[PDB]
Amino acid sequence: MKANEIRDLTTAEIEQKVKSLKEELFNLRFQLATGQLENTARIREVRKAIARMKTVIREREIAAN
């Protein structure tokens, strides 16, 4: 998904992207705490996706100078 990450422009790669993933992780952890989640690999894959987005943004910023 890294290529698709590059294709998006910078604001789109943070605004309404690293925010929806954050809120989804929040809801997922709430459901797990309550006691009804079933599928549990979602947490790990969401966290990995967030890290990917942050790293590509930082790479762009570093290359900009």
């Binding site: 954050k22 809120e23 929040f26 709430f30 459901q31 797990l32 309550t34 006691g35």
Partner: protein, 93 residues
């Protein structure tokens, strides 16, 4: 930086928690370095309700003895928020 969803971690569900929840009070676990004001704003932003007061407290770690080894569990910080009478109720499932 300091997104509001970073302050709240997970709800607390015991008999005491439900007893308090009967009276428009809700119990959370929050980050160990966050003061009451960020908790208040975070609850206001995430759910969209009205907050009246917040009370906070600190907990220590516990010693366990699994096997022949010994260790300790991590510290905790707990918050109790009280909504106003007009505000709606937070849908804690």
């Amino acid at each position: 930086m300091k997104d509001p969803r970073d302050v709240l971690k997970r709800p607390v569900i015991t008999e005491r928690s439900a007893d308090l929840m009967t009276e428009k009070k809700y119990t959370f676990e929050v980050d160990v370095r966050a003061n009451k004001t960020e908790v208040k704003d975070a609850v206001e932003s995430i759910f969209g309700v009205k907050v009246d007061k917040v009370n906070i407290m600190n907990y220590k770690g516990k010693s366990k003895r699994v096997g022949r080894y010994t260790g300790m569990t991590s510290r905790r910080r707990k918050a109790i928020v009280k909504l106003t009478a007009d505000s709606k109720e937070i849908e804690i499932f």
